Amino acid sequence: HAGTTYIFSKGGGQITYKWPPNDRPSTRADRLAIGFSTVQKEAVLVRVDSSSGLGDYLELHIHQGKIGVKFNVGTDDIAIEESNAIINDGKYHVVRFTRSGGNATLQVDSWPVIERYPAGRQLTIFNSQATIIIGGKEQGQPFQGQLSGLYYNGLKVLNMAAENDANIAIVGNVRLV
Amino acid sequence: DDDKLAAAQYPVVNTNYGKIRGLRTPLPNEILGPVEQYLGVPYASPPTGERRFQPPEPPSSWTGIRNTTQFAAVCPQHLDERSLLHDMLPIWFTANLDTLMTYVQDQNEDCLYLNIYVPTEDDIHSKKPVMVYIHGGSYMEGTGNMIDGSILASYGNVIVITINYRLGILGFLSTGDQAAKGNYGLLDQIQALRWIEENVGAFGGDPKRVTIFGSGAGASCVSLLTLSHYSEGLFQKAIIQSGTALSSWAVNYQPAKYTRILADKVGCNMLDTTDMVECLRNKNYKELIQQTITPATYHIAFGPVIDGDVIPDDPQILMEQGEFLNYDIMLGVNQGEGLKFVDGIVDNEDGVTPNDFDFSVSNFVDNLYGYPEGKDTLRETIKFMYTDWADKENPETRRKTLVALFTDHQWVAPAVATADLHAQYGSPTYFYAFYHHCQSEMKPSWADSAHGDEVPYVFGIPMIGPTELFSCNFSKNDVMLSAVVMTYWTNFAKTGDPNQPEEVAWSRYNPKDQLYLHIGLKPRVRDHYRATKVAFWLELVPHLH
Ligand SMILES: [Ca+2]
């Protein structure tokens, strides 16, 4: 945390973006970056869900204490986790993300660039990127730690979360440090 | 901003490739302002000597000023008065042709040039939008130069840009591999847009408000462009008039063989691709075009190949699911596009006869769906579907049904998917069925609005004492309609809603509802344009094999 900080907490505690329905980008490449600190066994950390009628989605998730991505742009679900790491302790980590189609690339703070290249023949594009659900409350499994200084395709999610700009929707047990 | 008069008479716009000095010109209409014109501007480097059959590199650079004040020659095209691509051109061409050729003569391969129309009026309520026009035909003909934008440019206060792009044999030749991958045309087009993206600002333009729009066979490119690795960034909204990238004559699936017909027929027999391409390169902007290569009835010889890059897979599979971005898209087809389908077989009484109706269906199932040898069922089904069992005899009804098939099966039916698939994934999709047309000689008295009748209403020619090309006797209505048309076309380019920035509500298309706009003399909004018959072609048909 060296930016516009934001806390997270017990019970119900999840944020919701909502792109303006006529305005749902869909890219070839997605660029997520966000630096957290949790203490929870199972969970969902963040999630862009596309829209209705669309199984395209992108979900960083705290399975087994290993914050690990899982996504379907079209055909099968891809998944880049680093399954060695009890990092879900309260410690702070700056977990970045790259994607060009099926090719993707995770990278926790400074460690190696663990990357997957599903050989099948994946599809290039997300579709109708609509809602960004940071919290996992609406997924069934919640998350209790924090995040900060967010960056996403050049759209600052949590500098704009405190400006209270139009499109944000904040309903949870949460703060600003 | 110095020689006030003489330097505002014909302006002086700094490109990144130099300064161009254009030309201010007013318009004849009463309620219509002047428009700055920069005719014959360069967007690439001449696809000359070496470049030929290779993608297009930037244009060069000068100092001082460069007179951009006349349309440069256009590309390799030769037009056999008949023995062209007849059946899918636009009515206003397949005849009239004669002196629709003040833009034929004057052909130099050094051809990649575009035209810029900028509205003079001061908008001091902000930078104006842009509209790049991909001109159609069947590839291998035509120019942007035959359509003058200024009328539109001015009316909507939007910048209009016609382009020239490589053509036909120079512009779409593919071995299908390595030495000549293909798709050179839509690639200059792409450079035209990346030139525009870069420079249009310095005229008066907003590169975030670029809309590409085409005339059917030109719309092909515009639909094909939605689907490219290359297109992303260069435009936002597209209007795709009178056809798609699924038309049987949109995509060329065997330039394999149709380059071999031309290779052998030019002293280029070598049976190794890279050897052969260097042959045709060292021939001539001549010779290679003066060759008659006949495509298979209802296909093209030289056209867009599915190379692997610019066009990455089958348009049907790409559209079918993912892979376009999100384009604010407005598309629609005319009532009786087909028309040219019932050539000759309409008597001077005014209809087609039954055992001439049947030979037509059976030189349709025979042409398009070769190999299946089920067909016949198809055939006796096709022709069950397209007879009116109320007026079983009535031979005018039987004439209309015929054109109405082709029309359904080559524009409407495909243009409803595309229209369906875009709504499906985020894109706002607005839809229109064009019913009105300007009526004149060349085009019979009974023809409903045929392919390419949409054009002059979109460009505003009914605000101007007609033309060659568009030699039709215009009414007061034609004016009043064009006004409604250009406002819907413009407003769409300005925002994402032909309505928004004394008329009717359009509203978005979207497969639950399927609202279309019925652009006739009185526009009314209807729903499910031809549902039953479009659902025929796109359902119980590929149900065979
Ligand atoms: Ca997808």
From Swiss-Prot, chain A:
The keyword Transmembrane applies. It is found in: Presynaptic cell membrane. Its main location: membrane. Residues 6-174 form the Laminin G-like domain. One of its GO terms (biological process) is protein localization to synapse. N-glycosylated. Keywords: Angiogenesis, Calcium, Cell adhesion, Cell membrane, Cell projection, Glycoprotein, Heparan sulfate, Membrane, Metal-binding, Phosphoprotein, Proteoglycan, Repeat, Signal, Synapse, Transmembrane, Transmembrane helix. The keyword Glycoprotein applies. Glycans are attached at residue 103. GO terms for molecular function: acetylcholine receptor binding; calcium channel regulator activity; calcium ion binding; calcium-dependent protein binding; cell adhesion molecule binding; neuroligin family protein binding; protein-containing complex binding; signaling receptor binding. Brain. GO terms for cellular component: axonal growth cone; cell surface; endocytic vesicle; endoplasmic reticulum; excitatory synapse; GABA-ergic synapse; glutamatergic synapse; inhibitory synapse. Ca(2+) binds at residues 56, 73, 125, 127. It comes from the Eukaryota. Neuronal cell surface protein involved in cell recognition and cell adhesion by forming intracellular junctions through binding to neuroligins. Plays a role in formation of synaptic junctions. Functions as part of a trans-synaptic complex by binding to cerebellins and postsynaptic GRID1. This interaction helps regulate the activity of NMDA and AMPA receptors at hippocampal synapses without affecting synapse formation. NRXN1B-CBLN2-GRID1 complex transduce presynaptic signals into postsynaptic NMDAR response. Belongs to the neurexin family. The cytoplasmic C-terminal region binds to CASK. Binds NLGN1, NLGN2 and NLGN3, DAG1 (alpha-dystroglycan) and alpha-latrotoxin. Binding to neuroligins is calcium-dependent, and the binding preference ranks as follow: NLGN1 > NLGN4 >> NLGN3 > NLGN2. Interacts with CBLN2 and more weakly with CBLN4. Interacts with CBLN1; interaction is CBLN1 hexamer form-dependent; CBLN1-binding is calcium-independent; isoform 1b does not interact with CBLN1. Interacts with CLSTN3. This is Neurexin-1-beta. It comes from Rattus norvegicus (Rat). The lineage of its organism: Eukaryota, Metazoa, Chordata, Craniata, Vertebrata. The chain holds residues 82 to 288 of 468 of the full protein.
Swiss-Prot record, chain B:
Residues 321-326 are annotated as: Interaction with NRXN1. Changing residue 176 to S: In a colorectal cancer sample; somatic mutation. GO terms for cellular component: asymmetric, glutamatergic, excitatory synapse; cell surface; dendrite; excitatory synapse; GABA-ergic synapse; glutamatergic synapse; membrane; plasma membrane. It comes from the Eukaryota. Keywords: Asperger syndrome, Autism, Autism spectrum disorder, Cell adhesion, Cell membrane, Disulfide bond, Glycoprotein, Membrane, Phosphoprotein, Postsynaptic cell membrane, Signal, Synapse, Transmembrane, Transmembrane helix. The keyword Phosphoprotein applies. GO terms for biological process: adult behavior; brainstem development; cell-cell junction organization; cerebellum development; learning; modulation of chemical synaptic transmission; negative regulation of excitatory postsynaptic potential; neuron cell-cell adhesion. Glycans are attached at residues 67, 473. Expressed at highest levels in heart. Expressed at lower levels in liver, skeletal muscle and pancreas and at very low levels in brain. Cell surface protein involved in cell-cell-interactions via its interactions with neurexin family members. This is Neuroligin-4, X-linked. The gene is NLGN4X.
